[PDB]
Symmetry: D2
Amino acid sequence: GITGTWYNQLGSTFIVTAGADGALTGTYESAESRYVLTGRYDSAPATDGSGTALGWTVAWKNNYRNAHSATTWSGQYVGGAEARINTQWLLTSGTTEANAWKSTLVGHDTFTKVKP
Amino acid sequence: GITGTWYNQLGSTFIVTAGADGALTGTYESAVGNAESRYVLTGRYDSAPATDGSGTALGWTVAWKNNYRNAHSATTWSGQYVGGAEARINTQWLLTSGTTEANAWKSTLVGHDTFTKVKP
Amino acid sequence: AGITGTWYNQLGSTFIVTAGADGALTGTYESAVGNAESRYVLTGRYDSAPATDGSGTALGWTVAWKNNYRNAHSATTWSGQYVGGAEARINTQWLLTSGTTEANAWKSTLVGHDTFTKVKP
Amino acid sequence: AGITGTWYNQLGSTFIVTAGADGALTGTYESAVGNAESRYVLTGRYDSAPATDGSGTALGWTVAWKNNYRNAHSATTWSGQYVGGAEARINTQWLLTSGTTEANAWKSTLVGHDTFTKVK
Ligand SMILES: COC(=O)c1cccc(-c2cc3c(=O)[nH]ccc3o2)c1
Ligand SMILES: COC(=O)c1cccc(-c2cc3c(=O)[nH]ccc3o2)c1
């Protein structure tokens, strides 16, 4: 249920293949705009109504731009008629030590299979 | 650089390779939690960082399933590598467990780990 | 209109708050989840002179989960901003830390996000 | 309770708090220098009847970064636990939210951690 195209609340698109070995691979488009993503998921989740745990990372460098930063999303996939990937994220920028206190933003993204 | 064997402040072991393409690959052995032996990790890093003294941004994920245990959970670490005399990777992390919807509000733990190339 | 009033989050918790002229937040919180029963004291702070460029109003508050009925040995802080408009909203992220031993401190803190409206969802 | 008094973080910030009998935290948060322009009101809550099994004491507090001299249009909350003893600590994680437009709300909140001690 994870493999495919997902859309967040703010116009980003998250394209992923969930491999048999637990790998997540794909591309993330935040709007020149496409970036590699890589992560992991629980390939043997419970079958009791619980979600499937997962996470992935995008480093914001491609052949066109480099923000010197990376985001990790941590969350769970929930299947069914209104399937979702519900996540919280951390976005760390490369900084000097003096600016490291303000290096990390936090937020949350909800992904759906149908454009918002 | 990033490639090497690292240890967090609690004794976990982070064996990572930073590839030419921005890929992080390797294994993680946890000193806490419902964990036993090595787990696969994968992630990404900035392969062309700034040249102004700033650190190198990175992140990686471990899903806590291997051939011996499955905790139905996954941790992501987000941080930066800082070079120098004692190289360091400073991170914050999120650990999400699979839950029912009614329990989703308590699904995610947060903390911070610092990694060096020497054991604590 | 403003921060003062009765608010509800997406899970049905009830947040009754007064925003004082000095920047103070006071009131009570009743949680729809967790080891909680009835109302708990909250205190916090807000920006009493927000920017005039369309930005929201920054704020935060704390509940320690002890009252006359129960004590969960934990505390939540919500950090967020009030957004005025047709449907007023307070958007927050929160940290819930439990008292633990040192060996369990790594798993002491939960994180999440709550959105509050003056209309109960 | 051991909480009342002056505490110092790892980066040169100071706070002076009073822990009231029924769970109130009140005080001031400032910089190491301590000039009036760096001082802000703080308010929060703590568990006034913690466990007796060796666990820490849960607490939290908020500073809105407005005083009579400047206004950053932002607020920080610290969530953590107090641990007593000869090397007492308050170990926290924090969230700093700025007032933003909706278009910029995705980047409104910074996260980090502070460790407070009784000595600078
Ligand atoms: C439900 O399962 C878990 O909560 C669990 C299981 C196994 C290992 C971990 C673990 C290890 C580790 C670490 O070294 N640093 C930061 C977080 C973290 O989490 C967590
Ligand atoms: C194990 O959990 C607790 O110790 C506990 C006890 C009482 C209430 C809560 C509670 C309510 C609430 C909420 O509405 N939003 C965000 C966090 C949050 O936490 C947690």
